[model samples]
Target chain A: MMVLVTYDVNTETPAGRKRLRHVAKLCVDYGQRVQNSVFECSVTPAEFVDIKHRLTQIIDEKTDSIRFYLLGKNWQRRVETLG
Target chain B: MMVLVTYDVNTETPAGRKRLRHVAKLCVDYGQRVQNSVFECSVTPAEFVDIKHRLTQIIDEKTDSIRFYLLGKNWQRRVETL
Candidate 1:
């Protein structure tokens, strides 16, 4: 399965900046960074649950947002890149 | 079907700003704006293709990026708002 992870973290403070960096590092370890705040990850169902858990713990519910798009096996044609 | 649309358009030029406003207006008609550049839309598959086509024409491929997450019928739990 392929999971597309996209996040928006409010980086207004030093702590927020640190959180941003930390989250990016964690995501990088899981997959490729397609954009500054978007990642395309190839993982199993179990891994998907695990990563989501980790991300939820790292971000503040009120100040940040993270979205996961579960693009099953046929994700190749589903995604389009104009550039 | 539910489609999550997110875009990042450079608004550093007058034309870019125009494009931004135009795109925003087009999206506003289709769904709710959940964030600065995010829209959560409940649309049919055919509607999705139509909107995607309109948006691609409004934005510059080299300068803007638009992503559509197509979540099938049972999309409720698949999307966690927190």
Candidate 2:
């Protein structure tokens, strides 16, 4: 499946900055970075579970948010990009 | 249809900053701001065309990038937030 991961981590504190970097690093390892804080990840069910678990531990639930878009298998046809 | 609009604009220059704000403002009018630079907009086919046209004019082709995800009508079920 194709999962589009997008996050916003409050970067006002050092701890927040660390969490942001950690989240980005994790996403980079799994997928292609589509934007500053968004990644398009192609992964197995198990890999998706692992990503969710790790991201859950990294983000501050109160101050940060992450959204996952299950783009499914035919995502290339569904996505459009412009510059 | 539900369109997921995401953008990354170069903000190192004044023109880039202006374009960034313009793009964000335009998106805010069309959809819910799900993240800092991401919006989930539910629009008709005509509205979608208008959005693309406006966004194209606001961004710099060389330095800015925007992606549109055609998530369709059942996007609510397809999307997960945490």
Candidate 3:
């Protein structure tokens, strides 16, 4: 499956900044960075579950938000890019 | 349809920064901001074309990248927010 991971980490404090970096780093390891805070990852079901677990652990639930769009196998037909 | 709009603009130059703000502002007018540079917009087919055209005009083709994810009417089922 192709998962689109997007996040918004509160950068109002030092810890928030650190969390932001950590989250981005983890996502980078799993996929390609398509935008500053968004990544396009191709992973198996088990890999997705693992990555999601890691991401949930790194974020402050009260101050941060993460979204995962399961693009599935038909992602190529669903996504359009321009430059 | 629910369209997910994401952008990456070159911010090294003043004009690039301005373009980034402009593109973001336009998206804000159309939908809700889901992330720093991502928007989830619900629009008709015509509206989608209009917004896409406007965004294309605001970006520098060589230095900027924009993506549109057409989530369709089943988007609520297709999207997962955590």
Candidate 4:
């Protein structure tokens, strides 16, 4: 039982790769990569936050921009909610 | 800043989608979908765990299967780790 999970990032700094790896592992697994610079993952909210925090801590305060999102529980299906 | 994310589920019932949506929202926002039955997300560790538990609870007692993954710092590089 898990809610929402998904991520895509692009880093251009010298240490960006390290930061990327650190963030990726925070999920339930190593996950698959959509592109060389973008990774996809699946994990719980608690784990997501923990990983996010850890990444910030690991990277020196001089890094560039970072962004993450949670699309939990907002999915829509073609079928109606009721039977 | 946030980390890993990704979920592939088949709940076999109407309620399954609801569970899916709940978990997805815990991250920084509503993410993207790769396939018809799968999705891609980016969230913080705390958010990820929170969503995980939430879905586990939201779904009714009857369900089929659910899977999630995280690929953090373990990734290898073209050369090696410094």
Candidate 5:
């Protein structure tokens, strides 16, 4: 599993907020927010594609700059889901 | 399975090439190279950490800079592996 993250760069519009919240919600379906705009999602490659596609659909919002990263592994999911 | 990659910016020595080759192999064990230095390595989260730790230990040879990327998802590996 990869820890997917999205860091919001500059989303100041009402629409941007709505989009951010919506996408953020989609992310939480698989993972959670570990920081301000960073999220942690785990999925199979197929599911990972699904998530990236969802992002691509609205990559424009991210163009202003939403950074994503995969944490080393499941740092929190293990703790939260297991412990 | 996510595709992981390591891109070689510059490998000036046998040692540098050696590290990049090792990482690239790790990626190939899971994926393949699409571009010059880019590869697709799918792995468990634990596997990624283990590979990265190995990279860090030998990162000095990569002081010039080695880039890494993640592919969309099981593109080539799907065919190669399956």
Candidate 6:
């Protein structure tokens, strides 16, 4: 499956900054960053579950938000990049 | 249908910032902002089309990006809000 992953994390504290980088690294393991806080990841359903599970473990529920748009297999046409 | 609308508008310039607010206003017409740049819109298919059409015209293609995650009607479970 092709997933468009986007995240918003609080960057006010030093720890928050560190976690930001850590999250980016985790995302890099699965796909590429299409924006500063957005990524385009290609993975299997099982891999997706694992990825989300790991992310949930790393992020704070009160300050951070992460989302995955499951575009299935045919995600290319669904995504439009103007720039 | 329920659509998860996410946007990344270039806010480096004054015009970009202005456009950002404008885009937010446009979005407010269709849904509520769930995050700084995310919205959970409950709209019909035709309404969704109208929303997208208007957004494409407002944003600068070279510098801005907007995406709609169509989670269909049963999007509550599909979306895990944590």
Pick the TM-score winner: 2
Checking candidate 1 for backbone clashes, the offending pairs are none
- The candidate that achieves the highest lDDT relative to the unseen native structure: 2
Residue pairs in collision within model 5: A45-B1, B4-B41, B31-B40
Better of 4 and 6 by lDDT: 6
Considering the two chains of model 3, state its CAPRI-style docking category.
medium
Itemize residue pairs with steric clashes in candidate 6: none
Q: List where candidate 6 sits over 4 angstroms from the true fold.
A: A10-18, A81-83, B10-18, B44-46
Ranking by lDDT: 2, 3, 6, 1, 5, 4
TM-score of model 1 (CA atoms):
0.70
Predicted candidate 2 versus true structure: per-residue lDDT over A1-83, tens digit per residue: 88899887655467876897898899988778877778998788999888899889989898889999987667889988889
The residue-by-residue lDDT of candidate 4 on B4-82, one tens digit each, is 3333333334465666566455433635544333344566667666666665665443433334534233211211110
Candidate 3 per-residue lDDT, tens place, B43-63, comes to 888998898889888898887
For model 3 chain B, where is the 10-residue window of minimal lDDT? B8-17
Q: Comparing candidate 1 with candidate 3, which one achieves the higher DockQ?
A: 3
Fraction of native Cα-Cα interface contacts (under 8 Å, chains A and B) also present in model 2 = 0.81
Winner on TM-score between 1 and 2 is 2
User: How much lDDT does each candidate structure score?
Assistant: 0.73, 0.83, 0.80, 0.42, 0.52, 0.73
Candidate 5 chain B lDDT trough over 10 residues, lowest sum: B73-82
Q: What's model 3's overall lDDT?
A: 0.80
Whose DockQ is greatest here?
2
lDDT of 1 by residue, B1-82 (tens): 7777777664446776687688789888878776656677878778877888899888888878887766666766565554
Every model: iRMSD: 3.2, 2.3, 3.0, 15.0, 13.6, 3.2
Query: Could you give candidate 6's per-residue lDDT for residues A1-83 as a string of tens digits?
Result: 77777787655467776777888899888889776667778888899888888888888878888877665555555554433
TM-score of 3: 0.75
Report how far off residue A67 is in candidate 6 (Å).
Answer: 2.3
lDDT of 3 by residue, A1-83 (tens): 77888787645478987886888798888778876667888888898888878888899888788888877567768888878
Clashing residue pairs in candidate 3 (N, C-alpha, C atoms within 3 angstroms):
none
Instruction: Note the DockQ of each predicted structure.
Output: 0.35, 0.63, 0.51, 0.03, 0.03, 0.32
Put down candidate 6 lDDT per residue, B1-82, tens digits, no spaces. Answer: 6666777765546787787688789888888887767777888779977878888888888877887666544545455443
- Chain B TM-scores per candidate, in order, are 0.79, 0.84, 0.81, 0.49, 0.59, 0.82
* The 10-residue segment with the lowest total lDDT in model 4 chain B: B73-82
User: Which candidate do you rate higher for lDDT, 2 or 6?
Assistant: 2
Native contacts matched by each model = 0.27, 0.81, 0.68, 0.00, 0.00, 0.21
